[PDB]
Amino acid sequence: KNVVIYADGVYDMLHLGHMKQLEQAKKLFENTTLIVGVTSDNETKLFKGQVVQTLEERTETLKHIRWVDEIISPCPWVVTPEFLEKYKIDYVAHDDIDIYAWLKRAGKFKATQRTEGVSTTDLIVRILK
Amino acid sequence: KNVVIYADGVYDMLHLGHMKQLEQAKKLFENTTLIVGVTSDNETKLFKGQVVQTLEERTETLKHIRWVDEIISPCPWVVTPEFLEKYKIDYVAHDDIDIYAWLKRAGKFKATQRTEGVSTTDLIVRILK
Numbered sequence: 001k002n003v004v005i006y007a008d009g010v011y012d013m014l015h016l017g018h019m020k021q022l023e024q025a026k027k028l029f030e031n032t033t034l035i036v037g038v039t040s041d042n043e044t045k046l047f048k049g050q051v052v053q054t055l056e057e058r059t060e061t062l063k064h065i066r067w068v069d070e071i072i073s074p075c076p077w078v079v080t081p082e083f084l085e086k087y088k089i090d091y092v093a094h095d096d097i098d099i100y101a102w103l104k105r106a107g108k109f110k111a112t113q114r115t116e117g118v119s120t121t122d123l124i125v126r127i128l129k
Numbered sequence: 130k131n132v133v134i135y136a137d138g139v140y141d142m143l144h145l146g147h148m149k150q151l152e153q154a155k156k157l158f159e160n161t162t163l164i165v166g167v168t169s170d171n172e173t174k175l176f177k178g179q180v181v182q183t184l185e186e187r188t189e190t191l192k193h194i195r196w197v198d199e200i201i202s203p204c205p206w207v208v209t210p211e212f213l214e215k216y217k218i219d220y221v222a223h224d225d226i227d228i229y230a231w232l233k234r235a236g237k238f239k240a241t242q243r244t245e246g247v248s249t250t251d252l253i254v255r256i257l258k
């Protein structure tokens with residue numbers, strides 16, 4: 001009955017958008033375990049960009065989120081089939097903007113919706129009045 | 130067996146310090162209900178200072194925190210004995226830096242520890258390298 005969901009990301013400076021994505025993930029099915037993978041500092045910087053918070057900081061904040069059942073920190077950048085088997089993961093949840101083609105082909109991808117305009121750094125903009 | 134804890138604050142731009150305080154509050158006793166009160170925009174500005182996020186935003190973020198069982202939003206600025214009776218509150222938890230004298234006299238105050246240097250706006254400083 002219980003379904004293992006895996007959501008990965010940077011989760012830098014956690015904001016409402018991240019938290020809403022985690023809720024979506026958690027709620028994909030009636031009974032779930034939500035595993036969150038947090039990407040490493042150097043892989044993020046290498047492939048995505050400067051991260052503000054360290055892995056240790058980004059991971060500690062996620063510990064406090066209601067939807068998060070388990071954390072894999074650091075997590076591998078690219079998910080692989082072996083990785084899915086190691087953690088008995090049933091679905092991978094992430095926004096969908098193809099690195100996730102093979103998961104969609106397998107029926108293992110559950111797209112989640114971004115919520116724009118609610119990023120921490122949008123808030124700094126508001127501080128600027 | 131179950132103990133009602135009440136923690137109030139602004140909780141603007143929620144960060145690790147807030148989340149650690151909420152965990153402390155929640156963990157004051159073995160079995161607790163943690164109620165969080167979020168202060169109104171105009172009372173905060175009037176007594177404390179400019180708030181970045183609205184009451185509606187500050188409250189929505191708290192919804193996602195694992196330790197939070199119930200939210201009172203907005204909450205009264207000053208807690209009163211009548212208020213404690215309305216919500217069957219057993220203890221009030223807040224940092225202790227006296228507005229809480231009457232609660233200490235009653236045995237109803239549980240001080241919590243700030244964690245400094247982990248505020249969102251300290252993070253903007255780090256962005257400045």
Ligand SMILES: Nc1ccn([C@@H]2O[C@@H](COP(=O)(O)OP(=O)(O)OP(=O)(O)O)[C@@H](O)[C@H]2O)c(=O)n1
Nearest residue numbers: 008009010011012017021094095112113114115
């Ligand atoms: N405003 C946002 C930001 C993120 N997410 C979700 O969180 C992402 C994973 O986290 P991250 O790797 O942190 O992504 P971004 O925040 O998209 O990236 P940037 O560094 O450019 O802010 C994806 O699952 C996406 O669905 C979201 O739903 N809404």
Ligand SMILES: Nc1ccn([C@@H]2O[C@@H](COP(=O)(O)OP(=O)(O)OP(=O)(O)O)[C@@H](O)[C@H]2O)c(=O)n1
Nearest residue numbers: 137138139140141146150223224241242243244
């Ligand atoms: N770094 C912090 C910030 C807040 N808190 C806790 O959260 C506070 C309640 O929230 P708020 O009213 O938001 O307080 P400050 O964050 O202290 O205020 P400022 O607006 O000056 O940042 C108190 O309970 C305090 O113990 C904490 O423990 N550590």
Ligand SMILES: [Mn+2]
Nearest residue numbers: 010011012013
């Ligand atoms: Mn991020």
Ligand SMILES: [Mn+2]
Nearest residue numbers: 139140141142
């Ligand atoms: Mn605050």
